[PDB]
Amino acid sequence: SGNTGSIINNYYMQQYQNSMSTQLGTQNNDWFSKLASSAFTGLFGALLA
Amino acid sequence: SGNTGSIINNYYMQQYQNSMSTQLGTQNNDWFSKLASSAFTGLFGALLA
Amino acid sequence: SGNTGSIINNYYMQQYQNSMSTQLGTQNNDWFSKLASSAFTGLFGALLA
Amino acid sequence: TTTTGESADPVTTTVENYGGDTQVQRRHHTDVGFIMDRFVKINSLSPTHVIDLMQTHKHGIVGALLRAATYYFSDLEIVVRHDGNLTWVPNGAPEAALSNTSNPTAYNKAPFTRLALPYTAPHRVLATVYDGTNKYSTQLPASFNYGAIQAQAIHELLVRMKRAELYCPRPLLAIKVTSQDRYKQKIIAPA
Amino acid sequence: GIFPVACADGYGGLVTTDPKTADPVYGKVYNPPKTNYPGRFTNLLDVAEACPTFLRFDDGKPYVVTRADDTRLLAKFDVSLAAKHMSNTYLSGIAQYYTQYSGTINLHFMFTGSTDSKARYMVAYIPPGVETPPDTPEEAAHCIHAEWDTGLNSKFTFSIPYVSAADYAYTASDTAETTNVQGWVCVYQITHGKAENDTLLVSASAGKDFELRLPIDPRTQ
Amino acid sequence: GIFPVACADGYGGLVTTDPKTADPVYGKVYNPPKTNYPGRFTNLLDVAEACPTFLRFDDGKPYVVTRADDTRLLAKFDVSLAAKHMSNTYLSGIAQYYTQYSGTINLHFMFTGSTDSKARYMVAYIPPGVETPPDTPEEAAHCIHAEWDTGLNSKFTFSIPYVSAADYAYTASDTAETTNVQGWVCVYQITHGKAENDTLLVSASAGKDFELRLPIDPRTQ
Amino acid sequence: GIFPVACADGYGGLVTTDPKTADPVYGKVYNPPKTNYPGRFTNLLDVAEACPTFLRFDDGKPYVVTRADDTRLLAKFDVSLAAKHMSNTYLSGIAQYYTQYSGTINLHFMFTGSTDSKARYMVAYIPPGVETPPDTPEEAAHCIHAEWDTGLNSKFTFSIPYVSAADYAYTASDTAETTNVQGWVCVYQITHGKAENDTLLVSASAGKDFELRLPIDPRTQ
Numbered sequence A, B, C: 001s002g003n004t005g006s007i008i009n010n011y012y013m014q015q016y017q018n019s020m021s022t023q024l025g026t027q028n029n030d031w032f033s034k035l036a037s038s039a040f041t042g043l044f045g046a047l048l049a
Numbered sequence D: 001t002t003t004t005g006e007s008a009d010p011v012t013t014t015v016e017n018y019g020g021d022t023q024v025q026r027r028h029h030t031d032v033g034f035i036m037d038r039f040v041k042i043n044s045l046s047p048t049h050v051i052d053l054m055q056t057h058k059h060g061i062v063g064a065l066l067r068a069a070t071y072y073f074s075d076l077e078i079v080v081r082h083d084g085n086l087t088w089v090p091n092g093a094p095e096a097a098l099s100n101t102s103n104p105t106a107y108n109k110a111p112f113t114r115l116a117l118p119y120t121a122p123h124r125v126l127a128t129v130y131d132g133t134n135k136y137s138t139q140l141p142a143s144f145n146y147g148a149i150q151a152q153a154i155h156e157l158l159v160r161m162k163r164a165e166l167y168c169p170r171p172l173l174a175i176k177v178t179s180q181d182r183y184k185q186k187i188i189a190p191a
Numbered sequence E, F, G: 001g002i003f004p005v006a007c008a009d010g011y012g013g014l015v016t017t018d019p020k021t022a023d024p025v026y027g028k029v030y031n032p033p034k035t036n037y038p039g040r041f042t043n044l045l046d047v048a049e050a051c052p053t054f055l056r057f058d059d060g061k062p063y064v065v066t067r068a069d070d071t072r073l074l075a076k077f078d079v080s081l082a083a084k085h086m087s088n089t090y091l092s093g094i095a096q097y098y099t100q101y102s103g104t105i106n107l108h109f110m111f112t113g114s115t116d117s118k119a120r121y122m123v124a125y126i127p128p129g130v131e132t133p134p135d136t137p138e139e140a141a142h143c144i145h146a147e148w149d150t151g152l153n154s155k156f157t158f159s160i161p162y163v164s165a166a167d168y169a170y171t172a173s174d175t176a177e178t179t180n181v182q183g184w185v186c187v188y189q190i191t192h193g194k195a196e197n198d199t200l201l202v203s204a205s206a207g208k209d210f211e212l213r214l215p216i217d218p219r220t221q
């Protein structure tokens, strides 16, 4: 979740507390996370340390 | 049920919360559900696809 | 009981919630129930049905 | 699909007939028990009021739907805004009993009183329409009610059908259309 | 933090018939023993079944008198817990506190004549649907009925059956009711031999399936 | 001590559609049995599927009449639950209480002519994107359509498909809408033989995937 | 009795950032599927790392121009998310909503000259503790720095390190601050060969350990 910090389980059922998502086919469809992790970190060329 | 979305079990007994049904003989006595499911879906006659 | 329909157990102990009964000897000392059940239901004499 | 229509046997074709794909349906909102389970208001009131679901407005979602059924059954919930204390009495009771406190009586507590009441009629089911030649010893038998309430003053009354059961459907009508094509109205939209 | 709670509107008020209990304030009291105290009753209908009480006829008598003339109808009354004839019974005393009933009501007839007084009676249940009850045994014969005569056994018991459109019937009667909704009971005298001025006591009790539901507090206070 | 509790602001008010239940006050009531009572329905769409009701044409008739002249368009209407032609159907009666729909709507055509009356019809779904519907079978041929003729079987059923940009469509129509958002249905008469003044009844019912969501109470009260 | 409860003072009020949820009133709504919708991002710093945006120099240009004269300092700016030169970056756009940061900020230099234009640059991080930044590569050499030249690869990336007294630094700058608390970055031009009027684009992005904490809503509304 994000910014909910209550320990106790909700008194109302999920189908009342929220809208229900449907699918056709929450997965790893995080484009920007992939993009960022793919960033080049090395060093192009030879090194003299 | 229908339009009740509380998780917690009721504080009052069922014989107080509601009237009690009696029988002489909730079953599948749903006429219209049967009627609708019995609807013809095919195609009368020969087909050329 | 009679006309109490709460599911949850009482917060107060029984010796506080009610007076305590004592015995010298709730049993089946129901005179009228016995009397009623003892009622004659048959048919005195011979029958022609 | 062609069929013998005079028989009145149900026929339900699908888009597959011409190459389509029938989709998935979720029909929770058209569930009878669910749809009838919401508060509806009763407009006419008085210090002494006999609970009759037919006093519901004929065009409201609950009243329209109830009238689209011949017979029905349900338990009930009521919200009453009243002055003084509220007394309820079951179906079949002498109107005079309403003055007595030993019948379920709710002492005034702001802002109103919400209560759960059981079905209480002597019939197995009730009706929205009754074809009586008379029915005595467009009128409904007096036994068709959920009891009565009384207070010093009854300002507002909401009623809710619980565990509703509907039988033998009847005509349900949309607004009469005057326009040449569609009934158009102002649908909500942001400013 | 602490537990969040929503104090709900429309809940919390005192209802005189509510299913909760109050909080105690004076504990540890032990009662004197009442083990096996006699005459206890736990359901009003047990005593209503076991103890029949009397009906009220003519000028306030618990009995009906054998007619010396050629009229054979001894009594006629509404099958109603609110009937004048039932007004002094224990059965009607309990019934006034309930809105609906269903089931069997039993009538008892106890002959009071001398050994040399003989008679033959008939009791009939006239269901609703006819304008006035028949004053003749011949017309009433077509209904559910029982005939009995006098002899060693002085009492005869008959069950008024519950036959109605709805599953329950009202205990009270509305002002707009002309004819009794549940019909009538007619007691006839087929004949008698030297039974002039001899009496037939009649009482009522609850039958095995008699039932009262929906408590009510209707009397003027 | 006792359990601490925070009575939260913004919670507790009565909402007419809330998911809670009231507190009871009158217990132990048993209802008359209604076991196997006939004609029960649990979902509005079961009856909307099983019982097609009639469309409204011309001067208030549930049918369309075969044209004697050289005009071939028998009827044209908006694919809208708020259409004038659908205004008397049970389908539109239910639909007014919901904000959105999706799925198949079925049309039924029942020929009413005598044995010696023959005809050939065509029904087409004109999707949105064109300014006015075609009044010619030749132009409408390029759309999704079906043609059928007269014979032993008097009824023909066709499915109006749900083809739209969004996954759901509004049941109601906004005043700012010129052209119907979901297009039209056009019924044509290819030809006929001695079918003058003969009728074609047209009705509608919910298809297998027809769906209504989001309950609403919109009528003036 | 019932459960005793202490309604506590000082608890219950609405706090706009509270960790609770409201009570529902309209249930059972299923959303259209949005499975695999493209371009999703779950953390602001993923896009801040992957998409570098441009710095602002001189008269509003995303680049620095090679000097024709004998001055070698191309640019000098405050290592501050509130710096004028960073004012148009996405990094500063996000940073304004947080009170503190820590970690690496990356600078990218992309040479824009023709094939026959050559140059040699140097970038240095001048930490705090000196009154004014050096305008000479010779003086700046003693700091952490990198030198690179022109060639087949047009871009060069350098990490501005987080070196400070406290573990976190403020994103905003106080009016009482004379010298920038976190120091400066100086870009120099060692030399060039026919690179007059040729450009060096400079952009910034979040490094691997860049971090923003403590959300804030500071803009005038």
Ligand SMILES: O=C(O)[C@@H]1O[C@@H](O[C@H]2[C@H](O)[C@@H](NS(=O)(=O)O)[C@@H](O)O[C@@H]2COS(=O)(=O)O)[C@H](OS(=O)(=O)O)[C@@H](O)[C@@H]1O[C@H]1O[C@H](COS(=O)(=O)O)[C@@H](O)[C@H](O)[C@H]1NS(=O)(=O)O
Binding pocket: E056, E057, E058, E059, E060, E087, E088
């Ligand atoms: O007016 C009556 O009904 C007369 O009442 C009966 O007496 C009651 C008595 O009134 C009552 N006291 S209370 O203060 O009213 O509570 C209590 O003591 O009980 C007795 C018995 O009542 S019972 O219900 O009949 O059992 C007379 O009975 S008694 O006095 O012999 O004990 C009863 O005979 C009276 O009824 C006669 O009068 C009625 C109306 O009176 S009038 O016409 O206005 O003058 C009349 O309607 C009755 O038909 C008539 N009884 S009859 O069958 O003999 O004709």
Ligand SMILES: O=C(O)[C@@H]1O[C@@H](O[C@H]2[C@H](O)[C@@H](NS(=O)(=O)O)[C@@H](O)O[C@@H]2COS(=O)(=O)O)[C@H](OS(=O)(=O)O)[C@@H](O)[C@@H]1O[C@H]1O[C@H](COS(=O)(=O)O)[C@@H](O)[C@H](O)[C@H]1NS(=O)(=O)O
Binding pocket: D176, D177, D178, D179, F056, F057, F058, F059, F060, F087, F088
């Ligand atoms: O004004 C109308 O729409 C006329 O209404 C229809 O009659 C209704 C009737 O009004 C209604 N009673 S209520 O109080 O309004 O609720 C109820 O009884 O139903 C009937 C049937 O209505 S339906 O929706 O058409 O099924 C007339 O039908 S009927 O009387 O034969 O039963 C209908 O023919 C009338 O519509 C005509 O007039 C419209 C406007 O009238 S005017 O121009 O101001 O004078 C016009 O817009 C319609 O086009 C026209 N119908 S047409 O197709 O024959 O031309």
Ligand SMILES: O=C(O)[C@@H]1O[C@@H](O[C@H]2[C@H](O)[C@@H](NS(=O)(=O)O)[C@@H](O)O[C@@H]2COS(=O)(=O)O)[C@H](OS(=O)(=O)O)[C@@H](O)[C@@H]1O[C@H]1O[C@H](COS(=O)(=O)O)[C@@H](O)[C@H](O)[C@H]1NS(=O)(=O)O
Binding pocket: G056, G057, G058, G059, G060, G087, G088
């Ligand atoms: O006053 C300025 O800062 C001038 O603003 C920039 O234009 C803004 C424009 O004002 C803004 N619209 S808004 O209503 O303010 O939101 C929006 O359109 O963006 C542009 C670009 O702003 S940016 O932050 O620089 O990217 C001028 O740029 S542009 O018009 O070419 O697009 C910018 O050049 C202006 O700044 C100059 O003037 C400043 C103060 O003006 S004055 O002395 O009072 O007359 C001065 O402090 C700046 O140094 C000067 N820029 S310089 O580097 O060329 O010298």
